[PDB]
Amino acid sequence: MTKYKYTVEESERFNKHGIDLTVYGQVDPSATVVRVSVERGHFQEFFNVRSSYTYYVVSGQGVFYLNSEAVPAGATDLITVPPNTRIHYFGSMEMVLTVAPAFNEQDERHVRFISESESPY
Numbered sequence: 001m002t003k004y005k006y007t008v009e010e011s012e013r014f015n016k017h018g019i020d021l022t023v024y025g026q027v028d029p030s031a032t033v034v035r036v037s038v039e040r041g042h043f044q045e046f047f048n049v050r051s052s053y054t055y056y057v058v059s060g061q062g063v064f065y066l067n068s069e070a071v072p073a074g075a076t077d078l079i080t081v082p083p084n085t086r087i088h089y090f091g092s093m094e095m096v097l098t099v100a101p102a103f104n105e106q107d108e109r110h111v112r113f114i115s116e117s118e119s120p121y
């Protein structure tokens, strides 16, 4: 009766600001985990007033901008962003993203769009 396993086949998959998200549909107030695929960048800067965003880099290479500070990232790195921190990123990467507490779109705030030409990837 308890659902323990979530598949890609049953996930919601969509493009948001230049990334391809795989939202499995985990419901758990403590944290939600999703997959992020990015070819060139996340062409939008945002922050979340409540949740920390932790990106594990499965493969590829990129650069995060966290409150405008460049943070290079490569395969096997863990990028840990606290709440209320402006986030965008460029790169060609596959990532596993944890949002803790659970992701709630009402907690996220739009700062700006970013031109696709800004990404060096």
Ligand SMILES: O=C(O)[C@H]1O[C@@H](n2ccc(=O)[nH]c2=O)[C@H](O)[C@@H]1O
Residues within 6 Å of the ligand: 016, 017, 019, 021, 023, 032, 033, 034, 036, 042, 053, 097, 099, 103, 108
């Ligand atoms: O976190 C990110 O880099 C991007 O992915 C989005 N996201 C992240 C987790 C989640 O469960 N659902 C989402 O839609 C977030 O809004 C942002 O655009």
